[PDB]
């Protein structure tokens, strides 16, 4: 079971499964030996939510079951939009 580390601008280290991080085409280009990525522009309150999106996407993609809404707090929406645009996810 392989994992990668995504580090936020404020130093928070997020360890997610490799398969999940490969959701972001941006991350896939740099990885798919190397398993550590620094995001000097993405704070932890945003990067933590990106990691939640990866789990959500892997879980619910091609699912027959009812898919729940992905929640986004108004306060993080603008920063999350910018991160998602860079990450291509």
């Amino acid at each position: 079971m392989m994992y990668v580390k995504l580090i936020s601008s404020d130093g928070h280290e997020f360890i997610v499964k490799r398969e999940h991080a490969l959701t972001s085409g941006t991350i896939k280009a740099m990885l798919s030996e190397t398993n550590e990525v620094n995001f000097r522009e993405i704070p932890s309150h945003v990067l933590s939510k990106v990691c939640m999106y990866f789990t959500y996407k892997v879980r619910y993609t091609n699912s027959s079951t009812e898919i729940p809404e992905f929640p986004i707090a108004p306060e993080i929406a603008l920063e999350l939009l910018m991160a998602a645009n860079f990450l291509d996810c």
């Binding site: 990106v50 999106y53 959500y56 996407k57 619910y60 993609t61 091609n62 027959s64 009812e66 898919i67 729940p68 809404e69 992905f70 986004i72 108004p74 929406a77 603008l78 999350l80 939009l81 910018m82 998602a84 645009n85 990450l87 291509d88 996810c89």
Partner: protein, 148 residues
Amino acid sequence: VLRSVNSREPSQVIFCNRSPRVVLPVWLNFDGEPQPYPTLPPGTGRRIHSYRGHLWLFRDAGTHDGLLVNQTELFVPSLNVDGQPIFANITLPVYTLKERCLQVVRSLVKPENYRRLDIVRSLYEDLEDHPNVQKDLERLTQERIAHQ
């Protein structure tokens, strides 16, 4: 190209909203013009009378966000075997995080104030490009053209 075929053969369907959105069912008329039908509140179902070979798509009634029906874009009523109605299961797609973010921002900011946001110019255009049934029908016909 994308239009209902005038079969005149009745087909009963269950529109089942398995999404948290208010659903706007849209029927593509004989000329390919989208025709809106009565909305469905979240988690509700309606037994409806349609026809074989007719085309339907489903949207969020308030924002026009794209929804899936039986895990795909379009639903075509078929032949009722043993009088069983056809199930049209409407669900949320797994939106990209970018599109989901655009949906949340558009819901909080009036279109007049998009240009007042502290974001790059490209994201202003992405925000202004509201989900549109006609634009999606153009995209869908273009995609069916790539298939020789």
